[PDB]
Amino acid sequence: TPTKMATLTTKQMWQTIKDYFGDGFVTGSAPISYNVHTCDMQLQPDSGIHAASDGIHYGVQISEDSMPLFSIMGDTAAPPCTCHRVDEIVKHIDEFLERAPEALPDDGAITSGKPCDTNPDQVSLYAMRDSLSWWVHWGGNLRPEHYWKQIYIGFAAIPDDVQISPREFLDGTYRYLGHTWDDCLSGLEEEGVSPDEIEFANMCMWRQMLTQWLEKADPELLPLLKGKISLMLQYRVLTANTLGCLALFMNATADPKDGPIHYADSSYEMEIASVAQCVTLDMAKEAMGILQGERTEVVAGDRAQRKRELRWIYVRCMQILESQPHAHMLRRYGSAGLHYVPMMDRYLERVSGHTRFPIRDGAARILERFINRAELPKESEDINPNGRS
Amino acid sequence: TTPTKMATLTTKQMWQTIKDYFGDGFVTGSAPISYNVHTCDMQLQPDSGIHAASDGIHYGVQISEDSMPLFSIMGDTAAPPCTCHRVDEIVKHIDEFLERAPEALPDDGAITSGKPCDTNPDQVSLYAMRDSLSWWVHWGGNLRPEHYWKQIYIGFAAIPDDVQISPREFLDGTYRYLGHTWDDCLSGLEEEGVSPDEIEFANMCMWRQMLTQWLEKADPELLPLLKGKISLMLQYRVLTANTLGCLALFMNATADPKDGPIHYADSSYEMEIASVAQCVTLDMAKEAMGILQGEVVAGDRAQRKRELRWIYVRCMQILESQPHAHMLRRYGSAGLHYVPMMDRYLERVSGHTRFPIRDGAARILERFINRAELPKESEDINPNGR
Ligand SMILES: C/C1=C\CC/C(C)=C/CC(C)(C)/C=C/C1
Ligand SMILES: C/C1=C\CC/C(C)=C/CC(C)(C)/C=C/C1
Ligand SMILES: [Mg+2]
Ligand SMILES: [Mg+2]
Ligand SMILES: [Mg+2]
Ligand SMILES: [Mg+2]
Ligand SMILES: [Mg+2]
Ligand SMILES: [Mg+2]
Ligand SMILES: [Zn+2]
Ligand SMILES: [Zn+2]
């Protein structure tokens, strides 16, 4: 086998994840591929009689009929089904990638929404803070055996706040806190994640990098999604990559004694949990007054109705999760935004005028080991200055 | 038979009654401020990082202690100093107050909600009913009618924080919560199948709450006496919040029916722990609400919060292995998601105003109002609720 090393074009990456993920329930949807048709989900009144081991006891439980009690919530309403037009979103992207250049002049630009950000590695450092904060609220710990899974969460965070070229992410030109993407894959191998598991998380990361970049590079894409909650929700869950992060979180959290995780068998419950968390993310952001106005706002337009539709989907996602095999992990994952948004600096910084909170010594010492200082550029050599020992 | 006697208890006899019921805690002479668990002796065990699917750690919100520095509204933790052995001095002072205090004060009935637009105490009760259902739901409960009177109980537990209620008027039926006397609630709990011994425990917890909520508003020398003594202030706040009595009824509504009736004698340990933990989450989440209101915490406040977090993480870790972790873990950490979502706290962030009760919420609250026993000035309460 002669050593070949040509890097894929952005168009070829898009085609690769098409071949890997295939179509979802809408023909022509690859790689925007979902198993569950949210519009066909049902919700039953709770019986009020539950066994001690029932899934309802996990996560945060808020019955649909109680939501009008919270002024920041309200009632629910079924959305109009726009799912079948996802193939039109794909064809649009296909056309955009056919004409877009392999490199944009603003690749590497900061898109965090916090104007005091000027160094992309400092933005990465704040993203590592955020990543560990999510991980903890999902139920995880900071133990060293999950280092590279936590780095994965960082890679999943940073393309939201920096415009990362998919090619540069792929070919190692882009580094997150000094790490290339391949470093993360190699580290996951060292941590014992199986090859097929790594490749799934890998393809989810390609898809995240691609969709994060597309919505920054294509001025028509976000306008095409807004107003169509089914399509917008499908897209925003890809840019958040809750599914890829979930797969690795399950790997880190499951006890091998309970038997191995059959991930294909769990694909539906995992998807539902990933969608549910993104809804609680925006539900809690709305309660903090930081959802309205952001460029990627999921509920833009008729905000009141779009939010009714999100709540409609959320309660149905959560009820289904009560009865899934991995409810002891996925219920909390699905509702985690309700407690991590009000506590995390990422969001309180937005409440506070889109500023930056200082990273105190305690947090800096945590973040230090996640920095590969040897591979930082000269202008970033002194990030996290209070975290060294 | 026995002749019909109906004399109402004096506020001292109320205080003495709950002393005989609750007895002393782990400190002698601490009745009725009785806690069996000494929070200062708690020890945090190391996290092996391996937890079975059935492990209680999966319930509620799990935040490892060593990760708390990542959050600017939090930080690290530090053990509190032990002042819980001075609780007997708090009792004897209260005795002194009640041996020279009237049975009726001038400002009994005044509104203490902290929201200046409140003028009608029955409207204040309506907002408290909204808050009560919101807590109940965030603990994990539902709105099914078989728990109506347990939800009324939460209302009785909420309202003494927002209205100065005389313990004797709460007892004799003079005070009505949305038209309900206290006896109406007790009678309803019986009709709902709560065993007599459970009702009486919840009853005595409500007696104790009404007394302590009234003592702190009446005696200006009580709270200053508590301030600076974190372990005593925390014990007193839990009594005035009545998380324990509310927990008892929530557990009764939520427990597996194959579970034998869960009596405080069986589970006093886990119930106290969970009751303390939830009150700490109030302090933790309210700091985030300060930012919303428009990180810099320092000095004694910052030290206070270090000690509350220390208690919280140790309480939550203990709940991992308790038999009712599938209920109490969520109860213990519930403030972390209900404070940022509830009107009660968003109203304060928004300038201590009041949010309108919209049609959907009014229709939920309607059935909790005994309109037949409302005063005339309150007959138009909850107008959009039919
Ligand atoms: C799976 C992740 C978190 C949960 C959802 C969320 C809040 C995403 C935001 C961002 C895209 C920045 C990070 C993704 C990492
Ligand atoms: C057990 C209760 C709620 C949870 C804790 C809390 C937020 C108390 C506030 C107040 C004392 C007004 C009500 C008590 C009812
Ligand atoms: Mg065009
Ligand atoms: Mg985004
Ligand atoms: Mg974003
Ligand atoms: Mg551009
Ligand atoms: Mg109070
Ligand atoms: Mg209060
Ligand atoms: Zn649809
Ligand atoms: Zn002590």
UniProtKB/Swiss-Prot annotation, chain A:
Pathway: Secondary metabolite biosynthesis; terpenoid biosynthesis. It catalyses: (2E,6E)-farnesyl diphosphate = alpha-humulene + diphosphate. Its cofactor is Mg(2+). Alpha-humulene synthase; part of the gene cluster that mediates the biosynthesis of xenovulene A, an unusual meroterpenoid that has potent inhibitory effects on the human gamma-aminobutyrate A (GABAA) benzodiazepine receptor. The first step of xenovulene A biosynthesis is the biosynthesis of 3-methylorcinaldehyde performed by the non-reducing polyketide synthase aspks1. The salicylate hydroxylase asL1 then catalyzes the oxidative dearomatization of 3-methylorcinaldehyde to yield a dearomatized hydroxycyclohexadione. Induction: Expression is significantly up-regulated under xenovulene A producing condition. The keyword Lyase applies. It comes from Sarocladium schorii (Acremonium strictum (strain IMI 501407)). The keyword Magnesium applies. Keywords: Lyase, Magnesium. One of its GO terms (biological process) is terpenoid biosynthetic process. Belongs to the terpene synthase family. Alpha-humulene synthase eupE subfamily. Signal peptide: none annotated. This is Alpha-humulene synthase asR6. GO terms for molecular function: alpha-humulene synthase activity. Xenovulene A is a natural product exhibiting little structural resemblance with classical benzodiazepines yet is able to displace high-affinity ligand binding to the benzodiazepine site of the gamma-aminobutyrate A (GABAA) receptor and could be potentially used as an anti-depressant with reduced addictive properties. It is an enzyme of class 4 (lyase). Its EC number is 4.2.3.104.
